Design a binder for these strands. Structure first.
Length: 227
DNA sequence: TGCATCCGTGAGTCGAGGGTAATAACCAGGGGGAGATAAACGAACGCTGAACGCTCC
């Protein structure tokens, strides 16, 4: 009877491991907009803006009602409550949201770091990153979905950057350098990944190659942005 | 006709500042406004999907 929800990838819902038919992208947008609010009520006004932004359909208010009605047929009675003219998600177990479950472990990683148990921090953070099932909010349209896509992609990088710092402190240089090459290729303006790559490369005895990374980074900022 | 009496009016200029008293007392009735609970409609939601199209195998 454990309800599970997925927001760190395609918008999915599970019951006892079985996938529920989460419906249209706009129905997925409605679910995501409530899930990422962590039980706070979303007014009908905020829900119209979340789904369509500045260009709502002329019958948008009826559409929200139609989408909400279909979710009630797929979700169990009482999770999606209607209060104050809006909708909220209630009665979720702890850790039912993959984002919420990852947040406790990520907060614990800060606690794990502060107690000095870097090994536990490495494993707990590792479990968090494996919860990312591809592109966040895949196939979900709308400005609110776009903003949350932006927020969680950026937030993912912060957890990777924090985990990678521990790798350099524990001597795992050779494994980390290879993955770091992909990150700087994927995030070319992200100087922090090249900083970690430069140090790891040098500690692998490739001192001459580290300065080549430096020459490339200054070039990219001067040629493309002038900074 | 004269004398005596009383009543009304006016009497500078600008400055400074706030409060005053006292004796049968009651049922009895009863009106009249000031605050407390169910009925008329239409508007949010609600599932009802049904009824249309929008992409996909």
């Amino acid at each position: 009877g454990a309800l599970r929800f997925g927001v760190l990838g395609p918008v999915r819902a599970w019951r006892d491991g079985e996938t529920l038919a989460t419906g249209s992208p706009q129905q997925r947008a409605l679910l995501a907009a409530l899930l990422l609010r962590e039980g706070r009520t979303a007014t009908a006004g905020e829900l119209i803006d979340a789904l369509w932004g500045e260009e709502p359909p002329s019958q948008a208010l009826a559409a929200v009602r139609t989408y909400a009605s279909r979710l009630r047929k797929v979700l169990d009675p009482g999770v999606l409550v209607s209060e104050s003219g809006g909708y909220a998600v209630r009665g979720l177990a702890e850790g039912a949201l993959d984002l919420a479950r990852a947040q406790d472990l990520a907060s614990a990683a800060e606690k794990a770091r502060s107690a000095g148990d870097l090994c536990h921090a490495r494993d707990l953070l590792r479990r968090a990153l494996d919860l990312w099932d591809g592109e966040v909010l895949a196939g979900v349209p709308g400005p609110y979905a776009q903003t949350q896509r932006v927020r969680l992609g950026e937030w993912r990088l912060q957890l990777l950057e924090t985990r990678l710092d521990m790798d350099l402190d524990q001597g795992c240089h050779a494994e980390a350098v290879s993955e770091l090459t992909a990150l700087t290729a994927a995030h070319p303006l992200r100087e922090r990944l090249r900083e970690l790559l430069m140090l790891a490369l040098y500690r692998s005895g490739r001192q001459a190659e580290a300065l080549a990374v430096y020459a490339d980074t200054r070039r990219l900022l001067a040629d493309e942005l002038g900074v």
